[PDB]
């Protein structure tokens, strides 16, 4: 009647268990992903339509940045542990893409320093099992939803996101029209 | 036709190729797509409807319909992004064939071991391709 596979979402062919209820991917290099979050804040937006306390997770990925990508991931992974994410997303996007001032593990290190994370406390867990586990939890979460590009989104690990099912001229609209698709798939 | 394309087709297929590997190995997902909006047409545009016989050259005009059409935008878009980004989009490093047309990305991406020209010549090799034929 009015909500379609291959249109605004696609249904995942081989659907993955134990999955996060909703889960996004992104690199700190894809100007698009940068848009997705920097410019349109889509997460925050989407966060808000979601039902009572339904887990909204978010993983970073490797292909873009060879050596650094990984550490960026590992680094990130930390922020997942310390529940710091919210305070580092933005320095990092910026540091990496926009400011072009990030080159090494430490430039990054320093950003956690910068954002209210203690240089030792941010290393205490960096090498911790907590993190290492988490990295893989990602490395493998991509691999599971047979992933090719970013940013990307998937609901209860069943439904990948067709953002082309939607407007491309009006932001204000596309967003809400986006968050909708997600809500819809959260009770399906 | 055949030759004038093949002569040049080769000379640009390989201008990619010849150097693809000498180019060490620059990243690209548009890569294939566009190199396929190439070899998908030229190969089967020589062989197309100018073909093994020349008294039926309209199958190619069709093969030159959906040809550099993509060839145009495949580069067109591709380059539209390169300084001018957009949310409702991606950035990958991956194979795909929505009907099991599979081998194609276990070979030409595989046995591969500057947007400037492409974008324009994908459209340059279009109006001239249409004018003289249609
Ligand atoms: C950015 O990605 C791409 C390339 O870079 C390695 C190419 O060389 C080529 C092919 C190059 C020539 C000169 C035909 C294409 C089509 C492409 O999309
Ligand atoms: Zn903003």
């Amino acid at each position: 009647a009015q909500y379609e596979d291959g249109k605004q979402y696609t249904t995942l062919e081989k659907p993955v268990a134990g999955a996060p209820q909703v889960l996004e991917f992104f690199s700190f290099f894809c100007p698009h992903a940068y848009q997705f979050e920097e410019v349109l804040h889509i997460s925050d937006n989407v966060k808000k339509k979601l039902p009572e306390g339904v887990k909204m997770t978010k993983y970073h990925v490797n292909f873009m940045g060879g050596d650094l990508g990984k550490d960026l991931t590992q680094a990130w992974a930390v922020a997942m542990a310390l529940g710091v994410e919210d305070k580092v997303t933005v320095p990092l996007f910026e540091g990496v893409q926009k400011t072009q001032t990030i080159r090494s593990a430490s430039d990054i290190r320093d950003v956690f320093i910068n954002a209210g994370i203690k240089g030792e406390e941010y290393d205490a867990a960096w090498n911790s099992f907590v993190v290492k586990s988490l990295v893989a939890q990602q490395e493998k979460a991509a691999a599971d939803v047979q992933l090719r590009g970013v940013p990307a989104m998937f609901v209860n690990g069943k439904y990948q996101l067709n953002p082309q099912g939607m407007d491309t001229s009006n932001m204000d609209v596309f967003v809400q029209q986006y968050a909708d698709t997600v809500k819809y798939l959260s009770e399906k | 036709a055949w030759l004038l394309m093949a002569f040049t087709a080769l000379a640009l297929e390989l201008t990619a190729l010849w150097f693809q590997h000498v180019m060490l190995l620059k990243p690209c997902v548009l890569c294939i797509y566009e190199r396929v909006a190439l070899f998908g047409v030229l190969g089967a545009a020589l062989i197309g409807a100018i073909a093994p016989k020349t008294p039926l050259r309209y199958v190619a005009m069709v093969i030159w319909l959906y040809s550099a059409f993509r060839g145009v935008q495949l580069t067109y878009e591709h380059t539209m992004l390169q300084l001018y980004p957009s949310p409702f989009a991606t950035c990958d490093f991956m194979v795909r064939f929505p009907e099991w047309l599979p081998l194609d990305k276990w070979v030409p991406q595989v046995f591969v071991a500057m947007p400037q020209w492409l974008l324009g010549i994908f459209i340059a090799y279009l109006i001239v391709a249409v004018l003289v034929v249609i």
Side-chain angles (χ1 to χ4, degrees):
Chain A
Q2 266 194 132
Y3 247 115
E4 334 216 74
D5 185 306
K7 192 56 210 166
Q8 329 90 278
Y9 74 86
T10 122
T11 272
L12 280 163
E13 198 232 27
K14 281 186 151 179
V16 164
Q21 262 193 306
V22 93
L23 187 179
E24 175 177 347
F25 281 64
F26 80 86
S27 187
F28 281 105
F29 280 101
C30 202
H32 305 48
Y34 172 111
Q35 305 298 297
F36 209 81
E37 203 51 41
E38 272 315 284
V39 197
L40 264 42
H41 308 324
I42 299 191
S43 316
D44 314 354
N45 271 292
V46 172
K47 292 204 227 285
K48 298 164 187 176
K49 251 83 137 60
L50 319 179
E52 303 146 19
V54 164
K55 315 281 146 155
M56 201 273 194
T57 303
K58 170 191 274 223
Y59 294 170
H60 169 255
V61 284
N62 286 345
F63 30 59
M64 299 177 74
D67 286 290
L68 227 212
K70 259 206 209 256
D71 326 293
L72 255 143
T73 298
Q74 196 169 357
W76 168 266
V78 151
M80 280 225 276
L82 337 177
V84 180
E85 311 114 316
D86 301 284
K87 297 189 289 78
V88 271
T89 291
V90 198
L92 283 157
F93 263 151
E94 297 289 332
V96 189
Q97 265 209 65
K98 223 191 122 197
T99 90
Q100 306 194 216
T101 62
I102 299 189
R103 306 166 251 274
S104 88
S106 168
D107 315 6
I108 312 157
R109 209 188 177 286
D110 297 314
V111 173
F112 290 81
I113 273 74
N114 262 267
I117 303 105
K118 276 288 183 299
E120 87 297 335
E121 183 196 41
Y122 154 87
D123 295 14
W126 166 287
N127 302 262
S128 81
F129 294 37
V130 160
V131 135
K132 307 235 191 305
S133 161
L134 254 54
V135 190
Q137 311 220 182
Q138 303 156 94
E139 270 182 59
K140 187 248 224 274
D144 277 2
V145 292
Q146 295 203 193
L147 186 71
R148 313 218 174 213
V150 274
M153 185 115 264
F154 314 68
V155 206
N156 318 307
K158 202 182 317 190
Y159 307 120
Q160 185 210 215
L161 267 273
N162 174 330
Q164 336 310 307
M166 338 204 176
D167 183 353
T168 57
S169 56
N170 197 330
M171 307 309 104
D172 253 306
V173 183
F174 164 58
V175 184
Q176 308 303 323
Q177 199 199 336
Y178 195 88
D180 254 316
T181 346
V182 180
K183 243 267 220 165
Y184 188 63
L185 303 161
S186 100
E187 352 85 357
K188 190 134 192 144
Chain B
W2 266 52
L3 307 183
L4 318 178
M5 285 137 52
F7 287 9
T8 204
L10 290 157
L12 302 155
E13 291 160 7
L14 312 157
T15 283
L17 286 145
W18 247 138
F19 319 121
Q20 277 160 11
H21 356 287
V22 187
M23 290 150 167
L24 312 179
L25 257 171
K26 253 212 174 175
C28 44
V29 199
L30 328 118
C31 213
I32 32 188
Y33 299 117
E34 303 166 14
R35 293 187 223 254
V36 126
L38 269 168
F39 300 25
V41 193
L42 344 159
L46 321 171
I47 315 164
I50 304 98
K53 283 180 182 179
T54 70
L56 201 125
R57 303 170 173 186
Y58 63 71
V59 173
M61 192 174 69
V62 177
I63 273 158
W64 290 32
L65 259 160
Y66 302 144
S67 72
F69 240 61
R70 278 188 300 130
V72 167
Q73 11 80 346
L74 290 213
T75 40
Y76 188 178
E77 306 158 25
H78 166 142
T79 220
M80 268 275 205
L81 334 165
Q82 210 69 46
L83 255 160
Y84 271 63
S86 277
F88 33 66
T90 60
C91 42
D92 315 16
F93 207 131
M94 285 277 85
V95 184
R96 26 204 25 162
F97 304 101
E99 74 100 56
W100 294 51
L101 210 291
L103 345 95
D104 272 81
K105 282 148 201 159
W106 304 114
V107 188
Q109 190 188 30
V110 165
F111 272 124
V112 146
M114 188 229 62
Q116 280 179 293
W117 324 116
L118 303 162
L119 340 153
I121 70 180
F122 274 81
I123 99 145
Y125 298 121
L126 239 219
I127 42 165
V128 145
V130 135
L131 273 152
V132 197
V133 160
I134 79 161

